[PDB]
Amino acid sequence: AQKEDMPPEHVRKIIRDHGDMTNRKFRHDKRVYLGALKYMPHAVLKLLENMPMPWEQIRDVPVLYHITGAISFVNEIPWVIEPVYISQWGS
Amino acid sequence: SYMLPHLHNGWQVDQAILSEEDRVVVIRFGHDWDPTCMKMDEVLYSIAEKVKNFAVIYLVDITEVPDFNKMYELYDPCTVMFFFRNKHIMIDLGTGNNNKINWAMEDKQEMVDIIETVYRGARKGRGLVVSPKDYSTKYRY
Amino acid sequence: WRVWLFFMRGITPLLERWLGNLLARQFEGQRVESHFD
Amino acid sequence: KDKSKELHAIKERYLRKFVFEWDASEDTSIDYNPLYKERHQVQLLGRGFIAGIDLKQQKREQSRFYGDLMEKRRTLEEKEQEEARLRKLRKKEAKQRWDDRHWSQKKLDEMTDRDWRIFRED
Amino acid sequence: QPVKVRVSYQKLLKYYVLNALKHRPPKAQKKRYLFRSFKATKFFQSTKLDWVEVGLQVCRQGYNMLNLLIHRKNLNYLHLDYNFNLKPVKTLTTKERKKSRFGNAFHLCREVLRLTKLVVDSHVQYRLGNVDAFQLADGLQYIFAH
Amino acid sequence: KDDEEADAIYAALDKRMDERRKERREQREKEEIEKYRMERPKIQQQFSDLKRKL
RNA sequence: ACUCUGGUUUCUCUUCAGAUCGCAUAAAUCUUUCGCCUUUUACUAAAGAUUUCCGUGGAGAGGAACAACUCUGAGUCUU
RNA sequence: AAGGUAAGUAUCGUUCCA
């Protein structure tokens, strides 16, 4: 057993369904939805830490998302060669 | 604290509110082991005999009676609620909250002051009485 | 840009605790002279 | 005025509101003596420059003392490459000065899409 | 240089020296990563995604969280817009005004969500051709400096 | 019973997250109060012998 | 110049962390000292002592991928 | 963010829920 990356469009079919509480897919399964919301501010960090870079047009990142689209963490740490980073900011 | 009568389940406190018509029921919700609750559960001791004519004091442990936490907002460590003829007597303090005394005080005269004011305003038939002292500060200086 | 991220790592557990207390099934919420008497 | 200030300093030694801008009373660079009021900036052999400041602005702002020192010591046999490298630099940044030009003196054919956006933004 | 940047130099050095002096060795731990436990949990999935998509996703998620916190006691006279500004739908009677009040923690969460929403919307503006890369960088610097 | 399982999963996850320094912080406080219990003992065992003599 | 030699990468679990864990640096709580001092919630700005948070190093264990292309020390190191 | 709820008596609408 191992963890594999679901197709990128799968999370999009959850967000559209999870636009509001009105959707009838999730009315009684609330103990699993809102429970993850306590970790929401943490997520706000993980993307501002991995925020796309001025020379980077598209910043593809690994994303760890809840099965109900309640949260979407940026499951990465922006490790950068620091001399390269300083040279790039010099340019 | 331990000297005052205690209520064990939800029915008992409702009965104690209902089993009286001519006094005021002063209920100290909280935990008698709390440093805050034990600070004023001795003030309520020192005046229980004095206010026997127009006040009866019952103690309630919210853990023992987890039936009024949500409805009356029992989440401050200590709470005091006044009831008259099965009617919660709102009292206007200096603090924003006007339904309870959620802090433990120190002077045995001021609590009798508040209880007698509540009784006086409840005989008239009010629902909100006004305390003599203002608790928007602590008068410390 | 980095400063607000250090602020973020500072405030992350505070909010992760306050929200947990708020968004839960069960909610929870001059003392020395009262101590030794 | 330095004397009175330094004597006064000797006498000193031996005897709600959400404001974001700091106060000018936290400034510490105030000095009563010249040797610390006006510190000799490091010329750094003339070949070293402060990071943030632009390079050629420092070069023209520089005291030129090492420039005249080099003019004194340099011999003719090794001045040809100095002149050649200097003129080649002047030419290669002249490339940038002319190719990358403001639209005020760039004709329509010279003007490019980036210059078109510059003009439209203006 | 003028006084308003000299004092800036001393105030930067003050915090630098304070951090250097108040530094302590990190405490020994057991290395319990957080997202790794999430990957272990059956409730989460991994996926490669564009960052701007992640920002537009997290903005909606936080907006939904804050609307749930607002409609936690079913008080319909407080409304959260998509810029994370909490406004009344009608002029507040005093009883309802006091009845609908949130502690400093909720306001702090809303404002940090507004900050991340501002950043994400600036990046979206960059991706939609509304602003230039230079404009995007200047706007990001203005956000993080104001 | 899925709600209870989800709540237990999240509680177990949080409890796992506090194991970063739980075993060390609790041991430190255990050793720390025992240094305080020397100068400032407990009242009940201050009255231990008299209670026994009762 | 003959030999045996034999992997690195990746994802986890479990602990130990001396060291700038980190050539970076936040927040909270408590106890003192000021400032303010009008009550909480914010503070004030230094000290000390804690905790959580974002990270890290090492060791071991378990899988997966290059597990089998190699490769390294040893050697008698054979015209 | 607060320390700024007057307490009430009426019919009417709605909705969950028993």
Curated annotation (Swiss-Prot), chain B:
Pfam family, one: DIM1
Function: Plays a role in pre-mRNA splicing as component of the U5 snRNP and U4/U6-U5 tri-snRNP complexes that are involved in spliceosome assembly, and as component of the precatalytic spliceosome (spliceosome B complex).
Family, per entry: Belongs to the DIM1 family.
Disorder this protein is connected to according to its UniProt record: Burn-McKeown syndrome: A disease characterized by choanal atresia, sensorineural deafness, cardiac defects, and typical craniofacial dysmorphism consisting of narrow palpebral fissures, coloboma of the lower eyelids, prominent nose with high nasal bridge, short philtrum, cleft lip and/or palate, and large and protruding ears. Intellectual development is normal.
Segments crossing the lipid bilayer: none
Disulfide bonding pattern of the chain: C37-C78
A GO CC term attached to the entry: U4/U6 x U5 tri-snRNP complex
Entry comment on modification after translation: The disulfide bond seen in structures determined by X-ray crystallography and NMR is not essential for protein folding and function.
Stored InterPro entries: Dim1, Thioredoxin-like_sf
GO BP annotation list: cell division; mRNA splicing, via spliceosome; RNA splicing, via transesterification reactions; spliceosomal complex assembly
Sites bearing Phosphoserine, chain numbering: S131
UniProt-reported outcome of changing C37A: Viable when expressed in S.pombe
Originating species: Homo sapiens (Human)
Keywords: Cell cycle, Cell division, Deafness, Disulfide bond, Mitosis, mRNA processing, mRNA splicing, Nucleus, Phosphoprotein, Spliceosome
Source taxon at top rank: Eukaryota
This protein's name: Thioredoxin-like protein 4A
CDD domains in the cross-refs: DIM1
Coiled coil: none
Record localization: Nucleus
Predominant cellular place of this UniProt entry's protein: nucleus
Swiss-Prot record, chain D:
Superkingdom, taxonomy of origin: Eukaryota
Residues annotated as transmembrane: none
Cell compartments where the protein resides: Nucleus; Chromosome
Post-translational modification: In vitro phosphorylated by CLK1 and U1 snRNP-associated protein kinase. Phosphorylated by SRPK2 and this phosphorylation is required for its association with the tri-snRNP (U4/U6-U5 tri-small nuclear ribonucleoproteins) and subsequent spliceosomal B complex formation. May be phosphorylated by SRPK2 on Ser residues in the SR domain; the phosphorylation is required for the removal of inappropriate R-loops during transcription.
Function: Involved in pre-mRNA splicing and its phosphorylated form (by SRPK2) is required for spliceosomal B complex formation. Independently of its spliceosome formation function, required for the suppression of incorrect R-loops formed during transcription; R-loops are composed of a DNA:RNA hybrid and the associated non-template single-stranded DNA.
SUBUNIT field: The phosphorylated form (by SRPK2) is a component of the U4/U6-U5 tri-snRNP complex composed of the U4, U6 and U5 snRNAs and at least PRPF3, PRPF4, PRPF6, PRPF8, PRPF31, SNRNP200, TXNL4A, WDR57, SNRNP40, DDX23, CD2BP2, PPIH, SNU13, EFTUD2, SART1 and USP39. Identified in the spliceosome C complex. Interacts with ERBB4. Interacts with ERCC6.
UniProt record similarity statement: Belongs to the DEAD box helicase family. DDX23/PRP28 subfamily.
Name under which the protein is recorded: Probable ATP-dependent RNA helicase DDX23
Curated annotation (Swiss-Prot), chain E:
Identification of the protein by name: Pre-mRNA-processing-splicing factor 8
Lineage, uppermost ranks: Eukaryota, Metazoa, Chordata, Craniata, Vertebrata
Record function comment: Plays a role in pre-mRNA splicing as core component of precatalytic, catalytic and postcatalytic spliceosomal complexes, both of the predominant U2-type spliceosome and the minor U12-type spliceosome. Functions as a scaffold that mediates the ordered assembly of spliceosomal proteins and snRNAs. Required for the assembly of the U4/U6-U5 tri-snRNP complex, a building block of the spliceosome. Functions as a scaffold that positions spliceosomal U2, U5 and U6 snRNAs at splice sites on pre-mRNA substrates, so that splicing can occur. Interacts with both the 5' and the 3' splice site.
Coiled coil ranges: none
Domain observations: The MPN (JAB/Mov34) domain mediates interaction with TSSC4 and SNRNP200. Has structural similarity with deubiquitinating enzymes, but lacks the residues that would bind the catalytic metal ion.
UniProt-annotated location(s): Nucleus; Nucleus speckle
Tissues in which the protein is found: Widely expressed.
Membrane spanning stretches: none
Taxonomic source organism: Homo sapiens (Human)
Full-sequence range covered: 439 to 584 of 2335
Swiss-Prot record, chain F:
Signal peptide, first to last residue: none
Lineage: superkingdom: Eukaryota
Full protein segment contained here: 96 to 149 of 941
PTM info: Phosphorylated by PRP4K during spliceosome assembly.
Lineage of producing organism: Eukaryota, Metazoa, Chordata, Craniata, Vertebrata
Subunit note: Identified in the spliceosome B complex. Identified in the spliceosome C complex. Associates with the U5 snRNP particle. Component of the U4/U6-U5 tri-snRNP complex composed of the U4, U6 and U5 snRNAs and at least PRPF3, PRPF4, PRPF6, PRPF8, PRPF31, SNRNP200, TXNL4A, SNRNP40, DDX23, CD2BP2, PPIH, SNU13, EFTUD2, SART1 and USP39, LSm proteins LSm2-8 and Sm proteins. Interacts with ARAF. Interacts with AR and NR3C1, but not ESR1, independently of the presence of hormones. Interacts with USH1G.
Function: Involved in pre-mRNA splicing as component of the U4/U6-U5 tri-snRNP complex, one of the building blocks of the spliceosome. Enhances dihydrotestosterone-induced transactivation activity of AR, as well as dexamethasone-induced transactivation activity of NR3C1, but does not affect estrogen-induced transactivation.
Modified residues (Phosphoserine): S48
Protein name: Pre-mRNA-processing factor 6
Tissue expression per record: Widely expressed.
Record gene name: PRPF6
Subcellular location: Nucleus, Nucleoplasm; Nucleus speckle
